[PDB]
Amino acid sequence: LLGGPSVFLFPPKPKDTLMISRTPEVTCVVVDVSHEDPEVKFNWYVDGVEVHNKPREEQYNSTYRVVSVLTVLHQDWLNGKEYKCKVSNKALPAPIEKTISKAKGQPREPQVYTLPPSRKNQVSLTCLVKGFYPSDIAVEWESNGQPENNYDTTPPVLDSDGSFFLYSDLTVDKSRWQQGNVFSCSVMHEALHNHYTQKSLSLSP
């Protein structure tokens, strides 16, 4: 397998699994396919039963990169079904197989805490999100209903008690803060009521 193609199988976006309006999908990524062997075939399995459905390929200098995407059903993922990507290519000893599923274990509700805002010309607004399981989570910010994209979020990290925690921080203009704009950190997780919660912070007297 060394110098040959590598395969990566990605779970669906947490946000996608937790909204009926969107469609969650697993993604099977193949890079470093040899110039001599462009044909790459994908076989998808849900718990064992083969499914459908085309794969997307492009040339990158000496090699090929191929991505295959399969829609999943919200429930199948949340209920813990196992998804398998099988990648076949003429240069491979035996087809490569990858497997992904939602972590099993008792779900635990995240707890969200806005923190003391801190300070030239910009303000840091932060949210702690902790006590959650599994680690699949979506953390976002908004203001006046519209999204705020200038934020960092730490990857979930395991706590002593076996739950996960993270830290999200949003940078805003000092003046938008001083003008009393309401800023919110929204969290989506399977263990929350309505799969959603929100905590707000503003400058108010």
Added chain:
Amino acid sequence: LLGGPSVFLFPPKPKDTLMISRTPEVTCVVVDVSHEDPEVKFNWYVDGVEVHNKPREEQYNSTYRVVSVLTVLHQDWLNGKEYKCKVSNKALPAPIEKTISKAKGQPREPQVYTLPPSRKNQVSLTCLVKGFYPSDIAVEWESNGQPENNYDTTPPVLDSDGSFFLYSDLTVDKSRWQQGNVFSCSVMHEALHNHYTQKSLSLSP
């Protein structure tokens, strides 16, 4: 102790540890401090030696939340020194101690791959980043040198070979794509030459 104060100690942002112009800091977060006991005091230790430099506090209904930040030295963090947060409050049996350091293990260079773009009115541009250790990493996007914030990045995940891998997804206007704008996927990691690599993606004939 339940359900008194809980403490969370956070490492410095990867981007801050890897740029000479920024200040990396460890952050000690205390939540659910009882109304009756506002005083929270902080002891900071690097490898076991007390350092100095105040904490911010605020009331949230019936509780207090307190955050204490300590500037660290780039070299100290990368060299694997151990940071200790010790939190003292009158409601605690014994003061609470939290400890953090860079994971030890042989550093491995991330490998960065732009992937085939995919198609309403919007284009998904994607980057695979894999083969890296430790998981401390920063991933961002630019167009014409300016930052693009409308992306999502999976938390680093452990690969069978002991290294980490992730997937980052930027959403762009179809028209900015068609107009030939160069979109760039910037990665920062300790094992990279210059601590930085860029892979770019555009529509070109």
